[PDB]
Design a protein around this ligand. Structure first.
Ligand SMILES: Nc1ncnc2c([C@@H]3O[C@H](COP(=O)(O)O)[C@@H](O)[C@H]3O)n[nH]c12
Length: 262
């Protein structure tokens, strides 16, 4: 399980693009690709996990745990008290998986502590503890990622609204930007300011499974039945071929079976 280091506290757009290109390479299966887009592995490929160590201002850090299969954030760890590792598992992680998060985030038994995330990883839940109607009313941005790390890292009590806020910014800026070349670009275009997520980024997020299925199953470049999507303005967008959607997508979700490789 490799860990990819990224310093939030001091960056430029080349460094962000190198980080995501490093997470992508690390997460993708080495050989599975459909129409030139790399595919995430089968649950069986070892390693099953990737770790992302986010380094913020002030020697505040959080390590993000991600499953290679679907790039999901299973929980996080922060350095706590002098020599302790405090792991935080999402409420919807269960079975062997929970022991894995413990073990991989804080590899040293005798120095680890629990503080669970008492809610699940889905966006409607996260919005709810954030106390917002939609993620779009909470801004994203590098400075914001940094300060959020700062509100959580090593602090004794922090409240569910602070924790859901951190998680909404982190999942969108690490897992989503890696899946979609479009969201990576939205971050680069706004690199020195906060931005609010447009409709196309929220749409792409929620339709990533269906996109993966669709490109996998597309015959001779043409999709099985046209994909209705939303563009950055709000308008309905209809795609019929893999060339239409392929510029925005950097990683396909696992869908078993053969597909046109390249
Ligand atoms: N902890 C997490 N890590 C990564 N992605 C997600 C998501 C995203 O939410 C999207 C849709 O989930 P639903 O179809 O159940 O609403 C997917 O893009 C998924 O990746 N929710 N929580 C996440």
């Amino acid at each position: 399980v490799n860990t990819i280091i990224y310093n939030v506290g001091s960056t430029t757009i080349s460094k962000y693009a190198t980080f995501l290109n490093d997470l992508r390479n690390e997460a993708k299966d080495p050989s599975l690709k459909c129409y030139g887009i790399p595919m995430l592995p089968n649950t069986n490929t070892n390693p099953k996990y990737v770790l992302v160590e986010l380094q913020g201002s002030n020697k505040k850090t959080i390590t993000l745990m991600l499953r290679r299969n679907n790039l999901y954030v299973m929980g996080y760890s922060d350095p706590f008290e002098t020599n302790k590792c405090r792991y935080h598992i999402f409420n919807d992680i269960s079975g062997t998986e929970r022991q894995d998060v413990e073990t991989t985030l804080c590899p040293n038994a005798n120095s680890r502590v629990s503080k669970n995330i008492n809610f699940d990883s889905r966006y409607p839940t996260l919005e709810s503890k954030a106390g917002v109607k939609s993620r779009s009313q909470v801004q994203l941005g590098i400075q914001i990622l940094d300060s959020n790390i700062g509100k959580i890292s090593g602090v004794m009590s922090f409240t569910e609204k602070t924790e859901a806020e951190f998680l909404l910014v982190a999942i969108q800026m690490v897992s989503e930007a890696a899946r979609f070349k479009y969201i990576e670009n939205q971050v680069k275009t706004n690199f020195n300011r906060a931005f609010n997520p447009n409709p196309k980024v929220l749409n792409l997020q929620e339709t990533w499974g269906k996109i993966s299925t669709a490109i996998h199953d597309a015959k001779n470049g043409v999709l099985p039945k046209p994909l209705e999507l939303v563009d950055a303005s709000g308008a309905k967008w209809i795609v019929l071929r893999v060339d239409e959607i392929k510029p925005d997508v950097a990683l396909l979700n696992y869908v078993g079976g053969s597909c046109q490789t390249t």
